Amino acid sequence: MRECISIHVGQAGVQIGNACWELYCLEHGIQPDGQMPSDKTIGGGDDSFNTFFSETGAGKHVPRAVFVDLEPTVIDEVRTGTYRQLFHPEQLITGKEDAANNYARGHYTIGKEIIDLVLDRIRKLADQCTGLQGFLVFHSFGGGTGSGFTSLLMERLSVDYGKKSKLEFSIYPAPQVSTAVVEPYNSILTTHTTLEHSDCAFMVDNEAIYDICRRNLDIERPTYTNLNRLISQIVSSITASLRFDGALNVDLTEFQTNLVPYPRIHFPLATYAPVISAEKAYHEQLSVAEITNACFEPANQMVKCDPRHGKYMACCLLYRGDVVPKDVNAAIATIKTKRSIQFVDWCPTGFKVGINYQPPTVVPGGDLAKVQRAVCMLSNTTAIAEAWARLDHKFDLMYAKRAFVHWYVGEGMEEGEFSEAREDMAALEKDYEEVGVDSVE
Amino acid sequence: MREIVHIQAGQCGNQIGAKFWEVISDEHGIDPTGSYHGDSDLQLERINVYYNEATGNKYVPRAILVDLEPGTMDSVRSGPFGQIFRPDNFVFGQSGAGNNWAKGHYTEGAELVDSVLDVVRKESESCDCLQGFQLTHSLGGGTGSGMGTLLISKIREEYPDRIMNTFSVMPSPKVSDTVVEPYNATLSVHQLVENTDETYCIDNEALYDICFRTLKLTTPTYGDLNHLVSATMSGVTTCLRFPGQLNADLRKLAVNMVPFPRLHFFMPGFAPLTSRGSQQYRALTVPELTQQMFDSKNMMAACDPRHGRYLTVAAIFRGRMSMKEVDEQMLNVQNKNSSYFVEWIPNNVKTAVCDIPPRGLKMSATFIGNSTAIQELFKRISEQFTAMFRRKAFLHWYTGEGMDEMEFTEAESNMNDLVSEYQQYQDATADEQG
Amino acid sequence: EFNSQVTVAVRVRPFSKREKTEKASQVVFTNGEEITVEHPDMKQVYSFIYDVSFWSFDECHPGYASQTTVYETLAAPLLDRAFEGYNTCLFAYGQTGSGKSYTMMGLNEEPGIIPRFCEDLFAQIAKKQTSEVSYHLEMSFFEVYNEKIHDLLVCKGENGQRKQPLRAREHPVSGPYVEGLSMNVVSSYSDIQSWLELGNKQRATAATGMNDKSSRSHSVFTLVMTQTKTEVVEGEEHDHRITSRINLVDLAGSERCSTAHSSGQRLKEGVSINKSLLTLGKVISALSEQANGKRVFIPYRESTLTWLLKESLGGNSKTAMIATVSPAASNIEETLSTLRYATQARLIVNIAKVNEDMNAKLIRELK
């Protein structure tokens, strides 16, 4: 009835997808073989929740997703691991060669030869659906596939499907930490092509979750298995009202409206406040007021950006579990009282609320605890212009000497595409200033 | 699928590569018959990168052994892992190049080169998708310098969209092992600059210091030295054979290591190397490995990076590492040692992590670095070269095989321009205001 | 002591069939010397000054620069200096379908610069052909295609594939040159015209989305003129010789793969053109910064084009640039890249000298 297609692009989308479908199975009672044993004593219901899992008459449940990397190393871990009997065998690897961290290869050489094959399985999945609400693209700024192949896809998907929510959950490059020397080019050429096609892009940064895992969860040597489970919760909260009941339900078309003032500033951030271990799970009450304030603490942001250097435009608060609206209304009045959380003049009602009853589920082997409450904040702020400005400066240092361009030019790109992108990102940087000026009369 | 063809030219490469298959087979569970006697199921998943399946799950490597002397090929056959190579892939002749680059390029090598292309075209066409090539040679002689550089000139024409990696033993600064090292090392650089994408520069005097200063070895043979080179050769090609959290092919490194098409000369390294006693007194962890990798006394290139600036470096990790422990540590280098890095590349470091470590170590690491301190090696040859060519000392053995003095002057000015391309970057730069 | 500045000139082309089908707007306006670009969005206006500007937008409007006008304003000075004893270079630069080949070579009934140059050269020679001065003229015409060199002035043999590539080498004094190149003698305009026809027929052309006759190769026209003169000396006369190299260069365009619908050889050759322009650009950016005190190393070895033209962009030649631009609004950023590289080429300074063919010998020490 309500059905969402998730797309996982690259070595980062997948290892987040593996972190997601691990969780989507637990909440709904599915085993890794795709079977739902408990249904035999219900004889019905909708635990075979059609938002993510499609059911066969034999009792098996297939997830609605595409997994694409242009390399076999990451997906072949699925075909051989514990979640091999769950997915359709059509997981797409023409990855005889990778993109070499090159927007040109993911967009002009090797993004071809698989893109028509990728639209086919999506065209197949959608015809199995009735209420196609939107898409969920998991990718990473910094790669060739997650930057190039995503752009090429968001273009082609904006034609075959048109006016539907295309939500991105993207790993934004950290300011200092990085694992490549070509993230700026791949991140600036991506925004230039995705801005006219996407509808809302939720950013994350690994440099921040590393810090969150240190202070709160007391993990001093974490890895990506811990990071991606936190992301599995952000998406579960977003797509919860499409699965379970609640007091205030939130469709996908509500983030597109509340959090996008103008079509070019659709770059919000994500948080998850009650990230605490089983040790700190006691000793604390974990109220809505305890949780809601923790979503506004800059040290608990999943993107390395201080909103106190900027202003808020639209905030969306998604509540889970034993939550009562009186507890929420008292909280926002506390946040609107604090003067360090500044809102623009042209948005006095800068809050969106959603309440669902199903609490979060604890994955065995994880470091997160069991809680009766969980909250996810989605915020659009003017502070993220600082990060764009860093990225445009890095670009300028290494484009003025035409460094690394012959790798891009050698795979189908023109030198003029670099200058077009930088100016577009400069306009956006300027657009983030106009919205920060208080009007006069 | 990312298949690689290995080519071994000279008494050096055929002595290195012969250990390279003693090191890879132990990692994939292959015995000296080609039979599989391993433990894990990840070995056979991507064994096709280096090996081919023959009849009964016997595995034959994609090696190519070339030389102008049959003595080296007899050592392989009459050795530990001699019975696995394809006996139709041993190409050889007699009456070797005589330390003459003129013979291995024009006169003798040109007679034997088409035989080498017969093997290459058969192994490449038999491969599903070619990632690139791999050559182990020694420039300083005539076979590896001459007959190797000639093959690269030809494969680059037939396979111009594929990687051509090269592991080259360079002339050493203090003591020579061939009187005409400069003429042969020079002319090779004139060709490698135009026809390569990654050239790993090795020097034996550094390995003599590694084996003495770190490993505390008092009698290091060439087996031990080549037991170090084979390691780095395995680290570069690890993320194609085993999985991990952040994988890196050959092209992803070069795209992240070659900022301009001519600066593809690297200073490799390996960690953690230790003596057999101090092993029980160390703690294996990333901050202990990163200190060895970035140590100037763990390089194989005989060049001090502290006399220059790292344009860009890489680090390939193998084990159940923590990524926060990795990303935190690489940042500590740039912020601490910011003078040894360039300003117009904000992050001068790439990282990669595999999940399946080496046979007996819970964690290993491989290091690749592009620095302006490689200027010192080329600037030396240019001094020795012109000192000899200005008097025309040994030139009549090169002209008598069909060469001219102009071809000696071209290679001089090219190598001198590569010096200037590295020297502009080494001096600290500054914009007007920035 | 001499520091000859590079003569930059610009040529605005009229609308094309594509830019008339898509009713594209005029944004490049002129007033004479200056050229301005009013963006359609009307957020900022850029303007540039050049030594010479040409406006072929309208065949009726005053200021219309024709083939004869561009010749008499750009090439005729180069001919005067070439007779004086200087080396000369004239090279085009721009995007796909912008009027580079039309400007230099021209068509049958609309000649470009090359035929007019050779014609006026032979005319002045025939008018100054005394026993005091003799003249000897050699020509070459060659091609750069996928980083390979090719001779245009040969009648290829019949085969499945007959394009024998040549090699580039570095002579310690004369600089870079091509080994195996046909240098054909010429006595008058007819042989030049025949060789030009043969070369333009052997050159690489294809049909792409932005020009049906898109040149897929860089083209260099070299003229070596040796003029011999006398001086009354202790013995026989005919003891002075002056050599001059004239290099007329028509390059290709950047060719974005999206607009220029390209797959396979067109992509391949197009990509090669893109790598040749990136290198050339980097050499024009380093030569414009080396003329402002800052020390820089020009990368000429990263492309055969810049390697052969080492002596023209820099070194010893009086050189001139013809930037070619389109006035439509759908190509603003590419036109602006052309104009910025031209304004940087304006700052280049070379050291041009007379090729008396006598330095270090006897009259150097006379001097």
Ligand SMILES: CC(=O)O[C@H]1C(=O)[C@@]2(C)[C@H]([C@H](OC(=O)c3ccccc3)[C@]3(O)C[C@H](OC(=O)[C@H](O)[C@@H](NC(=O)c4ccccc4)c4ccccc4)C(C)=C1C3(C)C)[C@]1(OC(C)=O)CO[C@@H]1C[C@@H]2O
């Ligand atoms: C703890 C213990 O019992 O002994 C260790 C040992 O002493 C050390 C020093 C080993 C030892 O290595 C050497 O002694 C050596 C000698 C000459 C040149 C280079 C090394 C060791 O032989 C090496 C061996 O490690 C391996 O075998 C790796 O798998 C290695 N394998 C081979 O190269 C190999 C060679 C011939 C036949 C079969 C395997 C390897 C290295 C790189 C990539 C893949 C595999 C190990 C743990 C040890 C001994 C055995 C002492 C070290 O090996 C390396 C290069 O990784 C040297 O430093 C490491 C650290 C180890 O602790």
Ligand SMILES: Nc1nc2c(ncn2[C@@H]2O[C@H](COP(=O)(O)OP(=O)(O)OP(=O)(O)O)[C@@H](O)[C@H]2O)c(=O)[nH]1
């Ligand atoms: N959170 C998270 N981030 C990852 C993971 N793997 C890679 N990344 C991020 O991705 C960035 C690099 O891009 P990739 O993920 O490798 O993109 P890709 O799809 O592999 O593109 P290619 O490198 O061409 O194969 C790094 O900066 C990482 O921070 C992961 O498993 N989890």
Ligand SMILES: Nc1nc2c(ncn2[C@@H]2O[C@H](COP(=O)(O)OP(=O)(O)O)[C@@H](O)[C@H]2O)c(=O)[nH]1
């Ligand atoms: N590292 C290493 N280098 C070697 C070895 N054998 C030879 N070399 C080097 O190779 C060079 C000799 O050239 P070589 O190829 O053997 O000459 P050829 O026999 O005529 O082909 C010398 O400069 C040595 O430094 C070896 O076993 N290990």
Ligand SMILES: Nc1ncnc2c1ncn2[C@@H]1O[C@H](COP(=O)(O)OP(=O)(O)O)[C@@H](O)[C@H]1O
């Ligand atoms: N001044 C002009 N007058 C009339 N037609 C022109 C003029 N300039 C260019 N053209 C037309 O535009 C096209 C130019 O293509 P060309 O110059 O060969 O492309 P490129 O410069 O990329 O090689 C020709 O077909 C020519 O007829």
Ligand SMILES: [Mg+2]
């Ligand atoms: Mg990848």
Ligand SMILES: [Mg+2]
């Ligand atoms: Mg043309």
